[PDB]
């Protein structure tokens, strides 16, 4: 029989610190308390750009505390936005972990993002068109490259056991934590900072996603717009975020006196080979990512108390995910869809939701899924709604999926 976390074939990996910035709060513990209290981060957008272009979408969640309020003159000129978010969160995470001195040669970083420093592409383009090739910054390459945010964090914190950036669109932040877990269990690292970062809401990203016709335009009631698993859902809402966690072997954590928040037990990654921007309706490969995380953890489907759904509030996305949860045998788990309150942050969002899954285990509580008002018969799931649901949750799976047909499931356990 093959190695699992349960049979001791893989070393035990624990989560020992988490950090996130969201549309509710810069403080992840305050985001968590706000979720439990039924708070939404989704508001009318007041940006000039909305009026300038008369955008059909006029709602979204900007960060409560803008990243650039924390950035000095040189950081504004030498990093792209996702790099600035990565530096800010990396520093916060390391402080939260008690600023440990670790062996850099056993310390990895794995941070996903959906796109990278794209604003610096269009700035460089305009600069060159206006003034020629000598107007392009010598730092343009290193700001633009999508591994840029990960590399910033690796340099900031001193990681020498690998710095990796997987990109898989809306699953990138979960996929990064999966690859960090693989790097540890394969013996290449003992500690890893991992998660996802993403840019802010801006006109051109809203335009591009709007022409796919999958965004909510419930502009008169922003907080009611994101309705994952609800019968009247009508597309997703942007909500800014970035999120990192620190994971390490249990023996490394114990040696330094760190108190684990949860266990990261297993990771499954599959793909649909179905359609570029629609999930397979049958949920089969997505369900197999969940199953694979269980096999690696040493769990059975009946052990899973909780699923943190990718739950984007698109009609076809939530339906496919409900089928995937059935395929995995996890459809008696209690389900939360955090995008109901925090919206969608693309490359960051699977990291953010993995951090929420950790807090559910730590605190034995699931926040209500907002806007869940009319159960949908196609979606036969136990969606937590109305008020928090408390329980002694032992094991949970966090789901994330991405354009391209990427499926990533992470299996966490209570510590």
Ligand X SMILES: CCCCCCCCCCCCCCCC(=O)O[C@H](COC(=O)CCCCCCCC[C@H](C)CCCCCCCC)COP(=O)(O)O
Ligand Y SMILES: C=C/C(C)=C/[C@@]1(C)SC(=O)C(CCCCN=[N+]=[N-])=C1O
Contacts to ligand X by CB under 6 A: 81, 114-115, 118-119, 121-122, 124, 140-141, 144-145, 169, 198-202, 204-205, 208, 238, 240, 345-346, 403
Rounded to a whole number of angstroms, the minimum distance from the CB of residue 166 to ligand Y is: 15
Partner interacting with residue 398 (select from ligand Y, K ion, ligand X, none; CB below 5-8 Å by kind) = K ion
**Over 287-351, what HEC string results?**
HHHHHHHHHHHCCCHHHCCEEECCCCCCHHHHHHHHHHHHHCCCCCCEEECCHHHHCECHHHHHH
For residue 250, how far is the Cα from the chain centroid? 23
- Applying the rule CB under 8 A, the residues between 35 and 54 that interact with its own copies are 53-54
Partner interacting with residue 134 (select from its own copies, ligand X, ligand Y, none; CB below 5-8 Å by kind) = its own copies
Bridge pairing between strands 262-271 and 59-60:
unpaired
- Applying the rule CB under 5 A, the residues between 224 and 243 that interact with K ion are none
Q: Which of 301, 317, 347, 368 binds ligand Y (CB under 6 A)?
A: 317
* Binding letters toward ligand Y, positions 246-285, x by CB under 6 A: --------------------------x--x-xxx------
22 touches K ion by CB under 5 A: no
398 touches K ion by CB under 5 A: yes
Partner interacting with residue 353 (select from ligand Y, ligand X, K ion, none; CB below 5-8 Å by kind) = K ion
Rounded to a whole number of angstroms, the minimum distance from the CB of residue 405 to ligand X is: 12
Tokens matching residue 267:
């990771």
Q: Which of 353, 395, 405, 406 binds K ion (CB under 5 A)?
A: 353
Nearer to ligand X, 114 or 413 (CB): 114
77 touches its own copies by CB under 8 A: no
Are 85 and 242 spatial neighbours (Cβ–Cβ below 8 Å)?
yes
CA distances to 25, 197, 404 from 89, in Å: 13, 9, 28
Burial class (CB in 10 A: 0-12, 13-18, 19+), 51: exposed
Backbone angles phi, psi at 257, to 5 degrees: 75, 25
Nearer to its own copies, 274 or 415 (CB): 274
Q: Which of 37, 44, 76, 204 binds its own copies (CB under 8 A)?
A: 204
Partner interacting with residue 301 (select from K ion, ligand X, ligand Y, none; CB below 5-8 Å by kind) = none
Q: Which of 34, 90, 148, 222 binds its own copies (CB under 8 A)?
A: 148
Instruction: Report the distance separating Cα 145 and Cα 151, nearest Å.
Output: 10
Applying CB under 5 A, the span of 101-109, 154-162, 309-317, 373-381 interacting with K ion comes to 309-317
* DSSP code string of 375-399: B-TT---EE--SS-EE----EEEEE
Instruction: Report the distance separating Cα 231 and Cα 372, nearest Å.
Output: 8
- Applying the rule CB under 8 A, the residues between 152 and 171 that interact with its own copies are 152, 154-155, 157-169
Instruction: Report the distance separating Cα 379 and Cα 322, nearest Å.
Output: 6
94 touches ligand Y by CB under 6 A: no
Are 192 and 177 spatial neighbours (Cβ–Cβ below 8 Å)?
no
Nearer to K ion, 226 or 249 (CB): 226
């Amino acid at each position: 029989s093959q190695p699992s976390t349960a049979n001791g074939g893989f070393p035990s990996v624990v989560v020992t610190a988490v950090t996130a910035t969201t549309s509710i709060s810069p403080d992840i513990e305050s985001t968590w308390k706000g979720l439990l209290a039924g708070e939404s981060g989704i508001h009318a957008l007041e940006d000039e750009f909305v009026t300038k272009w008369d955008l059909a979408v006029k709602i979204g969640g900007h960060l409560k505390d803008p990243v650039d309020s924390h950035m000095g003159r040189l950081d504004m000129r030498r990093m792209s936005y996702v790099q600035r978010m990565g530096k800010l969160l990396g520093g916060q995470l390391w402080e939260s972990a008690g600023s440990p001195e670790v062996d850099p040669d056993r310390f990895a970083v794995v941070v996903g993002t959906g796109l990278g420093g794209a604003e610096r592409i269009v700035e460089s383009y305009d600069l060159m068109n206006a003034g020629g090739p000598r107007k392009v910054s010598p730092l343009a390459v290193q700001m633009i490259m999508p591994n840029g945010a990960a590399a910033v964090i690796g340099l900031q914190l001193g990681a020498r056991a690998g710095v990796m950036t997987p990109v898989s669109a809306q699953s990138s932040g979960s996929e990064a934590i999966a690859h960090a877990w693989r790097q540890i269990v394969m013996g290449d690292a003992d500690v890893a900072v991992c998660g996802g970062v993403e840019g802010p809401i801006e006109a051109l990203p809203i335009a591009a996603f709007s022409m796919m016709r999958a965004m909510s335009t419930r502009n008169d009631e922003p907080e009611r717009a994101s309705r994952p698993f609800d019968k009247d859902r009508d597309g997703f809402v942007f909500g800014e975020a970035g999120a990192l966690m620190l994971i390490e072997t249990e023996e490394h954590a114990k040696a330094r006196g760190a108190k684990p928040l949860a266990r990261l037990l297993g990771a499954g990654i599959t793909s649909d080979a179905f359609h570029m921007v629609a999930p397979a309706a049958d949920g089969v490969r997505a369900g197999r990512a969940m199953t694979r995380s269980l096999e690696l953890a040493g769990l059975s489907p009946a052990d899973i108390d909780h699923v943190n759904a990718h739950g984007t509030a698109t009609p076809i996305g939530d339906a496919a995910e409900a089928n995937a949860i059935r395929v995995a045998g996890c459809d008696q788990a209690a389900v939360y869809a955090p995008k109901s309150a925090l919206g969608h942050s693309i490359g960051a969002v699977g990291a953010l939701e993995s951090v929420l899954t950790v807090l559910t285990l730590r605190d034995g509580v699931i926040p209500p899924t907002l806007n869940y008002e009319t159960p949908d018969p196609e979606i036969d799931l136990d969606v937590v709604a109305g008020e928090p649901r408390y329980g002694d949750y032992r094991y949970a799976v966090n789901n994330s999926f991405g354009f391209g047909g990427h499926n990533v499931a992470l299996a966490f356990g209570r510590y």
